[PDB]
PDB file of C-alpha atoms in Angstrom:
ATOM      1  CA  UNK A   7     110.445-180.370  74.172  1.00 30.35           C
ATOM      2  CA  UNK A   8     111.688-177.081  75.305  1.00 32.22           C
ATOM      3  CA  UNK A   9     108.380-175.313  76.058  1.00 29.08           C
ATOM      4  CA  UNK A  10     108.192-171.601  75.391  1.00 28.63           C
ATOM      5  CA  UNK A  11     111.324-171.556  73.168  1.00 29.24           C
ATOM      6  CA  UNK A  12     110.984-168.960  70.384  1.00 31.24           C
ATOM      7  CA  UNK A  13     113.264-167.489  67.802  1.00 29.96           C
ATOM      8  CA  UNK A  14     110.903-165.425  65.730  1.00 27.98           C
ATOM      9  CA  UNK A  15     107.795-163.283  66.258  1.00 27.00           C
ATOM     10  CA  UNK A  16     105.196-161.783  64.023  1.00 29.30           C
ATOM     11  CA  UNK A  17     103.482-158.510  64.956  1.00 29.53           C
ATOM     12  CA  UNK A  18     101.335-156.001  63.119  1.00 29.57           C
ATOM     13  CA  UNK A  19     101.038-152.294  63.267  1.00 27.62           C
ATOM     14  CA  UNK A  20      98.014-150.408  64.660  1.00 29.29           C
ATOM     15  CA  UNK A  21      95.834-148.712  62.012  1.00 29.26           C
ATOM     16  CA  UNK A  22      94.389-145.241  62.976  1.00 27.89           C
ATOM     17  CA  UNK A  23      90.859-146.846  62.514  1.00 26.89           C
ATOM     18  CA  UNK A  24      91.447-148.922  65.675  1.00 26.41           C
ATOM     19  CA  UNK A  25      90.745-146.038  68.046  1.00 28.76           C
ATOM     20  CA  UNK A  26      87.073-145.689  67.180  1.00 29.73           C
ATOM     21  CA  UNK A  27      86.270-148.659  64.882  1.00 29.88           C
ATOM     22  CA  UNK A  28      87.853-151.770  66.476  1.00 31.25           C
ATOM     23  CA  UNK A  29      85.338-154.002  67.993  1.00 31.86           C
ATOM     24  CA  UNK A  30      84.798-153.901  71.760  1.00 31.63           C
ATOM     25  CA  UNK A  31      82.388-155.428  74.284  1.00 28.79           C
ATOM     26  CA  UNK A  32      82.750-152.539  76.884  1.00 24.23           C
ATOM     27  CA  UNK A  33      82.001-148.918  75.776  1.00 20.69           C
ATOM     28  CA  UNK A  34      84.239-147.262  78.395  1.00 18.99           C
ATOM     29  CA  UNK A  35      87.071-144.655  78.382  1.00 16.94           C
ATOM     30  CA  UNK A  36      87.950-143.887  74.816  1.00 17.50           C
ATOM     31  CA  UNK A  37      91.295-145.192  73.220  1.00 16.83           C
ATOM     32  CA  UNK A  38      94.311-142.838  73.447  1.00 15.73           C
ATOM     33  CA  UNK A  39      95.742-143.866  70.065  1.00 12.43           C
ATOM     34  CA  UNK A  40      99.096-142.195  70.641  1.00 16.72           C
ATOM     35  CA  UNK A  41      99.494-144.054  73.845  1.00 16.47           C
ATOM     36  CA  UNK A  42      98.275-147.386  72.288  1.00 15.99           C
ATOM     37  CA  UNK A  43     100.980-146.901  69.746  1.00 14.50           C
ATOM     38  CA  UNK A  44     103.603-146.311  72.480  1.00 15.00           C
ATOM     39  CA  UNK A  45     102.466-149.414  74.227  1.00 15.35           C
ATOM     40  CA  UNK A  46     102.717-151.461  71.131  1.00 14.70           C
ATOM     41  CA  UNK A  47     106.153-149.962  70.614  1.00 19.49           C
ATOM     42  CA  UNK A  48     107.434-151.095  73.897  1.00 14.54           C
ATOM     43  CA  UNK A  49     105.846-154.516  73.575  1.00 14.22           C
ATOM     44  CA  UNK A  50     107.741-155.115  70.342  1.00 13.72           C
ATOM     45  CA  UNK A  51     110.962-153.597  71.891  1.00 10.65           C
ATOM     46  CA  UNK A  52     110.915-156.198  74.718  1.00 10.86           C
ATOM     47  CA  UNK A  53     110.324-159.114  72.345  1.00 12.20           C
ATOM     48  CA  UNK A  54     112.948-158.062  69.896  1.00 10.66           C
ATOM     49  CA  UNK A  55     115.559-155.862  71.361  1.00  8.73           C
ATOM     50  CA  UNK A  56     115.588-157.124  74.821  1.00  8.67           C
ATOM     51  CA  UNK A  57     114.814-160.692  74.354  1.00  7.67           C
ATOM     52  CA  UNK A  58     116.404-161.109  70.942  1.00  7.18           C
ATOM     53  CA  UNK A  59     113.680-162.531  68.830  1.00  8.71           C
ATOM     54  CA  UNK A  60     113.765-161.901  64.997  1.00 10.05           C
ATOM     55  CA  UNK A  61     110.876-159.580  64.549  1.00 11.12           C
ATOM     56  CA  UNK A  62     108.627-159.480  61.496  1.00 12.38           C
ATOM     57  CA  UNK A  63     106.518-156.353  61.424  1.00 10.70           C
ATOM     58  CA  UNK A  64     103.473-156.307  59.202  1.00  7.43           C
ATOM     59  CA  UNK A  65     102.029-153.031  57.992  1.00  5.89           C
ATOM     60  CA  UNK A  66      98.776-151.707  59.231  1.00  3.79           C
ATOM     61  CA  UNK A  67      95.692-151.868  57.022  1.00  3.53           C
ATOM     62  CA  UNK A  68      93.144-149.098  57.758  1.00  9.48           C
ATOM     63  CA  UNK A  69      90.265-151.296  56.524  1.00  8.12           C
ATOM     64  CA  UNK A  70      91.103-153.773  59.262  1.00  2.90           C
ATOM     65  CA  UNK A  71      90.715-151.920  62.610  1.00  2.00           C
ATOM     66  CA  UNK A  72      91.709-155.051  64.515  1.00  4.16           C
ATOM     67  CA  UNK A  73      94.686-156.098  62.383  1.00  4.91           C
ATOM     68  CA  UNK A  74      97.067-155.512  65.385  1.00  2.00           C
ATOM     69  CA  UNK A  75      95.797-158.661  67.046  1.00  2.00           C
ATOM     70  CA  UNK A  76      97.579-161.215  64.982  1.00  2.00           C
ATOM     71  CA  UNK A  77      97.221-164.062  67.438  1.00  2.00           C
ATOM     72  CA  UNK A  78      93.608-164.455  66.412  1.00  2.00           C
ATOM     73  CA  UNK A  79      94.712-165.277  62.794  1.00  2.00           C
ATOM     74  CA  UNK A  80      97.279-167.881  63.241  1.00  2.00           C
ATOM     75  CA  UNK A  81      98.121-170.796  65.411  1.00  2.00           C
ATOM     76  CA  UNK A  82     101.582-172.179  65.390  1.00  2.00           C
ATOM     77  CA  UNK A  83     102.818-175.370  66.875  1.00  2.00           C
ATOM     78  CA  UNK A  84     106.325-176.502  65.979  1.00  2.00           C
ATOM     79  CA  UNK A  85     106.925-176.291  62.123  1.00  2.00           C
ATOM     80  CA  UNK A  86     103.155-176.112  61.291  1.00  2.00           C
ATOM     81  CA  UNK A  87     100.992-172.991  60.930  1.00  2.00           C
ATOM     82  CA  UNK A  88      97.221-173.094  60.966  1.00  2.00           C
ATOM     83  CA  UNK A  89      95.776-169.889  59.307  1.00  2.00           C
ATOM     84  CA  UNK A  90      92.434-169.528  60.979  1.00  2.00           C
ATOM     85  CA  UNK A  91      89.061-168.226  59.760  1.00  2.46           C
ATOM     86  CA  UNK A  92      88.250-165.659  62.600  1.00  5.89           C
ATOM     87  CA  UNK A  93      84.775-165.508  64.080  1.00  8.87           C
ATOM     88  CA  UNK A  94      84.412-161.831  63.226  1.00  9.01           C
ATOM     89  CA  UNK A  95      83.725-161.280  59.512  1.00 10.43           C
ATOM     90  CA  UNK A  96      85.496-157.776  59.614  1.00 12.28           C
ATOM     91  CA  UNK A  97      88.806-159.721  60.596  1.00 13.88           C
ATOM     92  CA  UNK A  98      88.615-162.413  57.831  1.00 11.02           C
ATOM     93  CA  UNK A  99      90.899-160.310  55.586  1.00 10.33           C
ATOM     94  CA  UNK A 100      93.694-160.343  58.172  1.00  9.88           C
ATOM     95  CA  UNK A 101      94.548-163.935  57.158  1.00  8.84           C
ATOM     96  CA  UNK A 102      95.963-162.716  53.767  1.00 10.37           C
ATOM     97  CA  UNK A 103      99.169-160.871  55.036  1.00 10.29           C
ATOM     98  CA  UNK A 104      99.659-163.469  57.981  1.00  9.79           C
ATOM     99  CA  UNK A 105      99.722-166.354  55.460  1.00 11.22           C
ATOM    100  CA  UNK A 106     102.277-164.590  53.415  1.00  5.76           C
ATOM    101  CA  UNK A 107     104.431-163.821  56.434  1.00  5.75           C
ATOM    102  CA  UNK A 108     104.477-167.390  57.729  1.00  4.28           C
ATOM    103  CA  UNK A 109     104.974-168.749  54.362  1.00  2.00           C
ATOM    104  CA  UNK A 110     108.367-166.698  54.280  1.00  2.00           C
ATOM    105  CA  UNK A 111     109.136-168.024  57.614  1.00  2.06           C
ATOM    106  CA  UNK A 112     109.177-171.550  55.824  1.00  4.72           C
ATOM    107  CA  UNK A 113     106.402-173.005  58.002  1.00  4.57           C
ATOM    108  CA  UNK A 114     104.058-175.846  56.732  1.00  2.00           C
ATOM    109  CA  UNK A 115     100.866-173.899  55.963  1.00  2.00           C
ATOM    110  CA  UNK A 116      97.384-175.157  56.687  1.00  2.00           C
ATOM    111  CA  UNK A 117      94.471-172.939  55.648  1.00  2.00           C
ATOM    112  CA  UNK A 118      90.930-173.026  57.453  1.00  2.00           C
ATOM    113  CA  UNK A 119      88.785-172.568  54.401  1.00  2.00           C
ATOM    114  CA  UNK A 120      85.525-174.290  55.664  1.00  2.00           C
ATOM    115  CA  UNK A 121      82.747-171.820  55.048  1.00  2.00           C
ATOM    116  CA  UNK A 122      81.162-173.354  58.269  1.00  2.00           C
ATOM    117  CA  UNK A 123      84.327-173.295  60.471  1.00  2.00           C
ATOM    118  CA  UNK A 124      85.359-170.314  62.691  1.00  2.00           C
ATOM    119  CA  UNK A 125      88.361-170.225  65.113  1.00  2.00           C
ATOM    120  CA  UNK A 126      90.229-167.248  66.849  1.00  3.20           C
ATOM    121  CA  UNK A 127      93.701-168.043  67.885  1.00  5.64           C
ATOM    122  CA  UNK A 128      92.764-166.204  71.164  1.00  4.69           C
ATOM    123  CA  UNK A 129      90.586-169.144  72.067  1.00  2.28           C
ATOM    124  CA  UNK A 130      93.465-171.599  71.819  1.00  2.00           C
ATOM    125  CA  UNK A 131      95.760-172.421  74.898  1.00  2.00           C
ATOM    126  CA  UNK A 132      98.709-174.549  74.005  1.00  2.00           C
ATOM    127  CA  UNK A 133     100.265-175.973  77.255  1.00  2.00           C
ATOM    128  CA  UNK A 134     103.134-177.720  75.481  1.00  3.34           C
ATOM    129  CA  UNK A 135     101.449-181.199  76.208  1.00  4.38           C
ATOM    130  CA  UNK A 136      98.110-180.482  74.736  1.00  4.56           C
ATOM    131  CA  UNK A 137      95.585-177.997  73.386  1.00  2.35           C
ATOM    132  CA  UNK A 138      92.642-176.584  75.261  1.00  4.27           C
ATOM    133  CA  UNK A 139      90.178-174.692  72.754  1.00  3.48           C
ATOM    134  CA  UNK A 140      87.428-172.369  73.956  1.00  3.08           C
ATOM    135  CA  UNK A 141      84.162-172.655  72.208  1.00  4.99           C
ATOM    136  CA  UNK A 142      82.739-169.160  72.120  1.00  6.28           C
ATOM    137  CA  UNK A 143      81.108-166.822  69.797  1.00  5.50           C
ATOM    138  CA  UNK A 144      84.280-166.534  67.940  1.00  2.00           C
ATOM    139  CA  UNK A 145      85.202-170.287  67.734  1.00  4.73           C
ATOM    140  CA  UNK A 146      82.930-173.240  66.925  1.00  5.83           C
ATOM    141  CA  UNK A 147      83.120-176.992  67.142  1.00 10.47           C
ATOM    142  CA  UNK A 148      84.041-177.283  63.445  1.00  6.40           C
ATOM    143  CA  UNK A 149      86.935-174.849  63.825  1.00  5.55           C
ATOM    144  CA  UNK A 150      88.209-176.762  66.888  1.00  4.75           C
ATOM    145  CA  UNK A 151      87.892-179.951  64.841  1.00  2.00           C
ATOM    146  CA  UNK A 152      90.023-178.639  62.042  1.00  2.70           C
ATOM    147  CA  UNK A 153      92.734-177.612  64.634  1.00  5.74           C
ATOM    148  CA  UNK A 154      92.674-181.179  66.078  1.00  8.36           C
ATOM    149  CA  UNK A 155      93.214-182.611  62.513  1.00  7.29           C
ATOM    150  CA  UNK A 156      95.999-180.180  61.891  1.00 10.12           C
ATOM    151  CA  UNK A 157      97.953-180.923  64.996  1.00 10.70           C
ATOM    152  CA  UNK A 158      97.434-184.750  65.238  1.00  9.94           C
ATOM    153  CA  UNK A 159     100.507-185.292  67.573  1.00  8.74           C
ATOM    154  CA  UNK A 160      98.589-183.439  70.395  1.00  4.39           C
ATOM    155  CA  UNK A 161      95.409-183.982  72.291  1.00  2.85           C
ATOM    156  CA  UNK A 162      92.777-181.227  71.828  1.00  2.30           C
ATOM    157  CA  UNK A 163      89.996-180.711  74.318  1.00  2.00           C
ATOM    158  CA  UNK A 164      87.364-178.074  74.290  1.00  2.39           C
ATOM    159  CA  UNK A 165      86.019-175.823  76.949  1.00  5.37           C
ATOM    160  CA  UNK A 166      82.960-173.546  76.981  1.00  7.03           C
ATOM    161  CA  UNK A 167      83.762-169.875  77.122  1.00  5.25           C
ATOM    162  CA  UNK A 168      81.042-167.709  78.794  1.00  2.98           C
ATOM    163  CA  UNK A 169      81.026-164.035  80.032  1.00  2.00           C
ATOM    164  CA  UNK A 170      84.353-163.608  78.073  1.00  2.00           C
ATOM    165  CA  UNK A 171      85.479-163.100  74.643  1.00  2.00           C
ATOM    166  CA  UNK A 172      88.209-165.820  74.436  1.00  2.61           C
ATOM    167  CA  UNK A 173      89.411-168.615  76.566  1.00  4.55           C
ATOM    168  CA  UNK A 174      92.670-166.601  77.072  1.00  5.96           C
ATOM    169  CA  UNK A 175      90.712-163.652  78.269  1.00  2.00           C
ATOM    170  CA  UNK A 176      91.172-165.180  81.700  1.00  2.00           C
ATOM    171  CA  UNK A 177      94.137-167.522  81.497  1.00  2.00           C
ATOM    172  CA  UNK A 178      97.627-168.349  79.732  1.00  2.00           C
ATOM    173  CA  UNK A 179     100.609-170.271  80.345  1.00  2.00           C
ATOM    174  CA  UNK A 180     102.987-168.747  82.887  1.00  5.91           C
ATOM    175  CA  UNK A 181     105.617-171.601  82.927  1.00  5.10           C
ATOM    176  CA  UNK A 182     106.191-175.148  81.710  1.00  3.79           C
ATOM    177  CA  UNK A 183     103.576-176.647  83.868  1.00  2.17           C
ATOM    178  CA  UNK A 184     102.013-173.455  85.181  1.00  2.00           C
ATOM    179  CA  UNK A 185      98.671-172.023  84.180  1.00  2.14           C
ATOM    180  CA  UNK A 186      97.900-168.421  85.078  1.00  2.00           C
ATOM    181  CA  UNK A 187      94.120-168.251  85.970  1.00  2.00           C
ATOM    182  CA  UNK A 188      91.686-165.670  86.949  1.00  2.00           C
ATOM    183  CA  UNK A 189      89.568-165.739  90.079  1.00  2.00           C
ATOM    184  CA  UNK A 190      85.974-165.110  88.744  1.00  2.00           C
ATOM    185  CA  UNK A 191      83.330-167.630  88.829  1.00  2.00           C
ATOM    186  CA  UNK A 192      83.597-168.089  85.119  1.00  2.00           C
ATOM    187  CA  UNK A 193      87.229-168.439  84.980  1.00  2.00           C
ATOM    188  CA  UNK A 194      87.472-171.033  87.927  1.00  2.00           C
ATOM    189  CA  UNK A 195      84.641-173.029  86.245  1.00  2.00           C
ATOM    190  CA  UNK A 196      86.674-173.244  82.957  1.00  2.00           C
ATOM    191  CA  UNK A 197      89.807-174.257  84.895  1.00  2.00           C
ATOM    192  CA  UNK A 198      88.073-177.129  86.630  1.00  2.00           C
ATOM    193  CA  UNK A 199      86.803-178.248  83.236  1.00  2.00           C
ATOM    194  CA  UNK A 200      90.196-178.248  81.655  1.00  2.00           C
ATOM    195  CA  UNK A 201      91.881-180.034  84.577  1.00  2.00           C
ATOM    196  CA  UNK A 202      89.132-182.637  84.439  1.00  2.00           C
ATOM    197  CA  UNK A 203      89.893-183.466  80.816  1.00  2.00           C
ATOM    198  CA  UNK A 204      93.574-183.893  81.350  1.00  2.00           C
ATOM    199  CA  UNK A 205      95.373-186.751  82.947  1.00  2.00           C
ATOM    200  CA  UNK A 206      98.309-184.232  83.558  1.00  2.00           C
ATOM    201  CA  UNK A 207      98.285-182.333  86.868  1.00  2.00           C
ATOM    202  CA  UNK A 208      99.044-178.474  86.074  1.00  2.00           C
ATOM    203  CA  UNK A 209     100.073-176.029  88.671  1.00  2.00           C
ATOM    204  CA  UNK A 210      98.213-172.789  88.726  1.00  2.00           C
ATOM    205  CA  UNK A 211      99.000-169.139  89.324  1.00  2.00           C
ATOM    206  CA  UNK A 212      95.744-167.552  90.552  1.00  2.00           C
ATOM    207  CA  UNK A 213      95.212-163.778  90.056  1.00  2.00           C
ATOM    208  CA  UNK A 214      92.397-161.595  91.181  1.00  2.00           C
ATOM    209  CA  UNK A 215      92.132-159.767  88.011  1.00  2.00           C
ATOM    210  CA  UNK A 216      90.888-162.042  85.049  1.00  2.00           C
ATOM    211  CA  UNK A 217      92.470-160.190  82.213  1.00  2.00           C
ATOM    212  CA  UNK A 218      95.759-159.956  84.208  1.00  2.00           C
ATOM    213  CA  UNK A 219      95.960-163.679  83.980  1.00  2.00           C
ATOM    214  CA  UNK A 220      96.948-163.204  80.321  1.00  2.00           C
ATOM    215  CA  UNK A 221     100.777-163.178  80.168  1.00  2.00           C
ATOM    216  CA  UNK A 222     103.598-164.249  77.780  1.00  2.00           C
ATOM    217  CA  UNK A 223     106.029-166.853  78.914  1.00  2.00           C
ATOM    218  CA  UNK A 224     109.192-167.466  76.972  1.00  2.00           C
ATOM    219  CA  UNK A 225     112.367-169.637  77.459  1.00  2.00           C
ATOM    220  CA  UNK A 226     115.139-167.568  76.206  1.00  2.00           C
ATOM    221  CA  UNK A 227     118.784-168.691  76.024  1.00  2.00           C
ATOM    222  CA  UNK A 228     120.967-166.645  78.474  1.00  2.00           C
ATOM    223  CA  UNK A 229     117.921-165.314  80.261  1.00  2.00           C
ATOM    224  CA  UNK A 230     115.919-168.424  81.177  1.00  2.51           C
ATOM    225  CA  UNK A 231     112.306-168.322  82.041  1.00  2.00           C
ATOM    226  CA  UNK A 232     110.846-164.984  81.101  1.00  2.00           C
ATOM    227  CA  UNK A 233     107.427-163.704  81.944  1.00  2.00           C
ATOM    228  CA  UNK A 234     105.816-160.635  80.499  1.00  2.00           C
ATOM    229  CA  UNK A 235     102.929-159.553  82.802  1.00  2.00           C
ATOM    230  CA  UNK A 236     100.712-156.581  83.362  1.00  2.75           C
ATOM    231  CA  UNK A 237     101.979-153.658  85.315  1.00  3.45           C
ATOM    232  CA  UNK A 238     101.192-152.727  89.038  1.00  3.52           C
ATOM    233  CA  UNK A 239      99.899-149.396  87.682  1.00  2.00           C
ATOM    234  CA  UNK A 240      97.241-151.199  85.628  1.00  2.00           C
ATOM    235  CA  UNK A 241      96.472-154.169  88.109  1.00  2.00           C
ATOM    236  CA  UNK A 242      98.167-153.511  91.508  1.00  2.00           C
ATOM    237  CA  UNK A 243      96.673-156.742  93.202  1.00  2.00           C
ATOM    238  CA  UNK A 244      97.600-158.970  90.257  1.00  2.00           C
ATOM    239  CA  UNK A 245     100.993-157.502  89.875  1.00  2.00           C
ATOM    240  CA  UNK A 246     101.684-158.530  93.585  1.00  2.00           C
ATOM    241  CA  UNK A 247     101.171-162.210  92.518  1.00  2.00           C
ATOM    242  CA  UNK A 248     103.515-162.058  89.743  1.00  2.00           C
ATOM    243  CA  UNK A 249     106.133-160.252  91.769  1.00  2.00           C
ATOM    244  CA  UNK A 250     106.371-163.370  94.128  1.00  2.00           C
ATOM    245  CA  UNK A 251     107.748-165.334  91.209  1.00  2.00           C
ATOM    246  CA  UNK A 252     111.498-165.025  91.873  1.00  2.00           C
ATOM    247  CA  UNK A 253     111.914-168.114  89.697  1.00  2.00           C
ATOM    248  CA  UNK A 254     111.024-166.092  86.377  1.00  2.00           C
ATOM    249  CA  UNK A 255     112.664-163.003  84.860  1.00  2.00           C
ATOM    250  CA  UNK A 256     109.749-160.601  85.131  1.00  2.00           C
ATOM    251  CA  UNK A 257     109.070-157.915  82.696  1.00  2.00           C
ATOM    252  CA  UNK A 258     106.104-155.691  83.312  1.00  2.00           C
ATOM    253  CA  UNK A 259     104.482-154.535  80.032  1.00  2.00           C
ATOM    254  CA  UNK A 260     101.666-151.845  79.727  1.00  2.00           C
ATOM    255  CA  UNK A 261      98.534-152.812  77.645  1.00  2.00           C
ATOM    256  CA  UNK A 262      95.851-150.603  78.910  1.00  2.00           C
ATOM    257  CA  UNK A 263      94.827-149.169  75.663  1.00  2.00           C
ATOM    258  CA  UNK A 264      94.698-152.467  73.584  1.00  2.00           C
ATOM    259  CA  UNK A 265      92.629-153.987  76.398  1.00  2.00           C
ATOM    260  CA  UNK A 266      90.029-151.323  75.790  1.00  2.00           C
ATOM    261  CA  UNK A 267      89.443-153.133  72.417  1.00  2.00           C
ATOM    262  CA  UNK A 268      89.702-156.565  74.104  1.00  2.00           C
ATOM    263  CA  UNK A 269      93.202-157.289  73.188  1.00  2.00           C
ATOM    264  CA  UNK A 270      95.375-158.778  76.035  1.00  2.00           C
ATOM    265  CA  UNK A 271      99.123-159.456  75.946  1.00  2.00           C
ATOM    266  CA  UNK A 272      99.129-162.593  73.960  1.00  2.00           C
ATOM    267  CA  UNK A 273      96.879-161.132  71.263  1.00  2.00           C
ATOM    268  CA  UNK A 274      99.450-159.015  69.770  1.00  2.00           C
ATOM    269  CA  UNK A 275     102.062-161.583  68.696  1.00  2.00           C
ATOM    270  CA  UNK A 276     102.551-164.972  67.098  1.00  2.81           C
ATOM    271  CA  UNK A 277     105.616-166.702  68.508  1.00  2.00           C
ATOM    272  CA  UNK A 278     107.544-168.934  66.297  1.00  2.00           C
ATOM    273  CA  UNK A 279     110.465-171.474  67.079  1.00  2.70           C
ATOM    274  CA  UNK A 280     112.574-172.037  64.062  1.00  4.58           C
TER     275      UNK A 280
END
């Protein structure tokens, strides 16, 4: 099928509490909230105004500092949506509003209710041909099993995620048969494992900065193959790699403030093809 096609996109506003209360592994430079809001605004602007997707914007919930990262709460494949049970307890309640939004988009809903199952959508890489699910501190075997049972039409393979929050903290799809991947020891090991479990040979787009390997690929009518990637200001050496892709419509998108709370490009949206 037409990989990357999307007609709708779900996003959620940033709560003021994100600045200081959102979970984060690195305690570095503080979040400039006003700037984070602007980066999110531009992100939504590209997806909706520029690319033409119908945008569903959910309201912020101050009691859920990480509610902006909608990707972790839902995995959509075709007409079916799997409402996950996030690994982090403080994010479990995010599923409530996402379930309602996807119900209204007329998708077949499947809820992950198993008290012993956890899965973050950020650990899920759908290549268009199969699923690769990262087993990390956010996603466990039972969660991955439930995903496999939900999307029976596709093969599901797991990969260990170490030294990183999610599988997509260092990879993502950059095209129909192209996997963007980081150059770290950890990222390369995961890549080898994924290619070892698949009979299909994937092409790779290797970038020097692991988090810059997270991009958003979309196939848009009248525009073709579109790729939203990190800016040269944020990752100069990785931007150079993306800029060589004259076969894609490249759109640089800032995400510096959300990355401070471990949210990369794919984390702030759930793409749907109706």
